[PDB]
Symmetry: C4
Subunit: 252 residues, 4 copies
């Protein structure tokens, strides 16, 4: 009650954030050392104890939190939920995903991720268009080339894999298209438009994400620092037409 | 008449759009399953029936439309025409192109495509410049390298293919230019400027398309939601000089 | 005199521009057909006559021009000069460069090229920085790797070639850096920073050219259509502070 | 005193800058000629003398400077310090780094570098996010693939190297992922998301650096030319609301 409020003053301090950070890093360094196959059984045992400890400190932390905010208002944050699952799941195979908590706990990092997630809706149609082009290209490539080139095109899955490699431009010619053209001389009529269209569309997708993500993140950094953001130049002129219509009705 | 108007209320509903969408997807899923060579004759027969059905539902749809708008005002839309050809052509070899109708029927997808098409005119000159550079490079590479490297440069078509691969940077050095230089030591004087100029110009082309397409699509999304778009800051200041010249002539 | 002025009305017409264009294309198509080694001697002889003709029409054109403007005011245009050299040089080895005249004669194409040239000064320092990084990297790579990898690094020229290939990311790892690391295990400490720095800087160079070129070309298209361009929003507000300081000194 | 002030008039002249530049270039040309292994002992001896001379002229220069500004106000500039270390270090293995002084001495070049350095803080979080993704990916790839593919993934360092190559898209499929999938058929589920996420994030990182660096450098070029820069449109409208609130309180 006064307890509830004094704990939150802990939870929300600089020093406590620094301590959870330091433990994420330590847990991460330890999962890193464990990839090393040459370790003694004792070394591995130790490292596995440091990990147990790290996981334990996280349970407390989360408890401190589920308490000092209650079940309703902890689980009202996606980051709390994510922190929750991440930690809880470890009480039941890629443990190293725990290092993602550097993102949930460091606010400037969290704001980068939020900008990117929030940008995803407005490129949904560019992405769907890419999806449709892939699907169509993969069906045609399977029918065209599957019998003569089955490792690359022998079924839909193979085709999609190969076309993704082709869109990334990786050995698309020496490794895929020239060998195809030795058997199907006009295959460039398929592959060259595929490349032009997917590279255009994937860059549209990337640029749209990045331009929006950056604008979102920047507003969030403003709000977090000062409680508000910059009004769009649009509003500034909208509102400049409220105070000019009034200065003209005054001026009569 | 009241019929004409009640059908359009169908045609233009949310639910009917959802139903045509669902049938495109189904037709697409089925052309996908058909790429699989291992299918029984019965399985193939069935799938081919589902496709026949899908095509049939599309004929009705289009009929519902050519009617409820008349021959003049259906064929006044490029999307209707495209839908028309796409569907009609199937009554006479890449059927999977029918999945492009996800674009013509879903409005946010249609607006992405429209932005891109509408951006094409204003990069026409950058594209023509790329075309001219290719043509010249391919003539020179044929004359320079065609006799000693005929698989890559033996004729104009070969040269253009190879240069396109070179502009995409795919094995341009280990696979093409170093082998060329073993016979023609100064060939880097050709290939390195080619790469610098085409990569600059193709990126100019891509960026111009994308920046314009995005601005067009965004206005179209505004118009579609609210019947108008944002006036350019330019007009907002143009018009701010109409109301400032009048507030100064009032103020005398 | 009235002749001078009536010729210019030819020179500057739409139809005459279309005719010079058509001849450039024809000359280009013919230099293209000549790359084909299989041609009869008669075919080659003919084609070579069409080229002679094309060159001749260009001499007239230029004459019509050097006349109707005089030696001083023809050679006052870089495009006229370029047209001049291009054509004159053919009266004394890459003839196909004549197709560059599509650029000098078509105004929208000329404006693309002008934007790019005019953008070059303002990226001069980014380019010089790239140059310095290359030079330093190539000296170090020669000293580090020249004795053990002389085909790639054996002298300064080899090094620069290889590093250019490395900056384009072409086989930089499977083909160059992994083989280097088998002999020099820490070579990634050289190559990975090289890549990060040159890819950052070359993209800075590209983006700077393109952003400026596009703004320049767009002003030139405005001027060419209407005799003026859009004032920068800056001037529009500068000038909005001239008419607001006067409306406040009026308002006293 | 009047000496102090007359020397600075040297130090800060155009001609003296041109002379230090010319000596950097000469020192650089000479370290370049020295990479050549075929040189006589006399040639090498000479070149090594030209370098000794170059280094000597630099000691004077720096002395002229440490004097005419004093120990406090020379070492108050990062460029002076950099110049200082660079030159002093040569009095005790990559000498060619001395050519970096073209950057410290030429002001437009220095302003390019400053924009880039100054842009680094505001992408710190995007970079940290890339770092975290790498670290996690490398731990997982080591555990997943290290035993079956130890040259690429056998330990954390190997994994990071390979993943960096994969993010650059260099042979990522023909050279790494297809061979991995022959043993681990679902490995595309790891590698394809890795590529999508790192290419998105590294481009975010690059674009953020470049957009900021260019805006910073451009303000610095303004300040250096005229003692001030352009006020942000924001301030121009902020301040346009100071003079509109006063013109409305006047107008009462
Ligand atoms: C932008 C959309 C990108 C979509 C890419 C998805 C590809 C799916 C790949 C897949 O399902 N495979 C089969 C897994 O069973 C991979 C095959 O390529 C494999 O058979 C090879 O080893 C030959
Ligand atoms: C940006 C412009 C890109 C234009 C690219 C067009 C390339 C046309 C390719 C072509 O016509 N070929 C011949 C088809 O007959 C391909 C040859 O490369 C082929 O002979 C090979 O198998 C050797
Ligand atoms: C951004 C700056 C890009 C500058 C790139 C310039 C490279 C100059 C290449 C050169 O002069 N060579 C020697 C020509 O004599 C090429 C060698 O690589 C050659 O010896 C090979 O066949 C082995
Ligand atoms: C964006 C982050 C990019 C980070 C990349 C760092 C890579 C570190 C590479 C390294 O430390 N190696 C071992 C050096 O001891 C390289 C190995 O790949 C080597 O063993 C090979 O020859 C097999």
């Amino acid at each position: 009650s006064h307890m509830s409020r004094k704990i939150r003053d802990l939870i929300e301090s600089k020093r406590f954030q620094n301590v959870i950070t330091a433990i994420i890093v330590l847990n991460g360094a330890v999962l890193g050392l464990l990839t090393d196959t040459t370790l003694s059984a004792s070394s591995q045992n130790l490292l596995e104890r440091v990990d147990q400890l790290c996981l334990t400190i996280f349970i407390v932390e989360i408890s401190l939190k589920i308490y000092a905010y209650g079940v309703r208002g902890f689980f009202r944050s996606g980051w709390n939920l994510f922190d929750f699952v991440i930690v809880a799941i470890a009480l039941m195979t890629f443990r190293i995903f725990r290092v993602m908590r550097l993102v949930s706990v460091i606010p400037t990092m969290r704001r980068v991720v939020q900008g990117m997630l929030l940008a995803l809706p407005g490129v949904g149609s560019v992405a769907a268009l890419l999806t449709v082009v892939f699907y169509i290209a993969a069906v045609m490539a399977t029918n065209l080339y599957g019998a003569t080139f089955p490792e690359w095109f022998g079924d839909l899955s193979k085709s999609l894999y190969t076309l993704f490699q082709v869109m990334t431009l990786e050995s698309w010619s020496m490794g895929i298209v020239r060998p195809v053209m030795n058997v199907h001389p006009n295959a460039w009529v398929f592959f060259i438009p595929f490349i032009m269209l997917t590279t255009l569309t994937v860059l549209n997708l990337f640029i749209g994400i990045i331009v929006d993500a950056m604008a979102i993140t920047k507003e969030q950094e403003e709000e977090a620092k000062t409680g508000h953001h910059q009004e769009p130049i649009s509003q500034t002129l909208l509102h400049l037409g409220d105070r000019l219509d009034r200065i003209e009705k005054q001026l009569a």
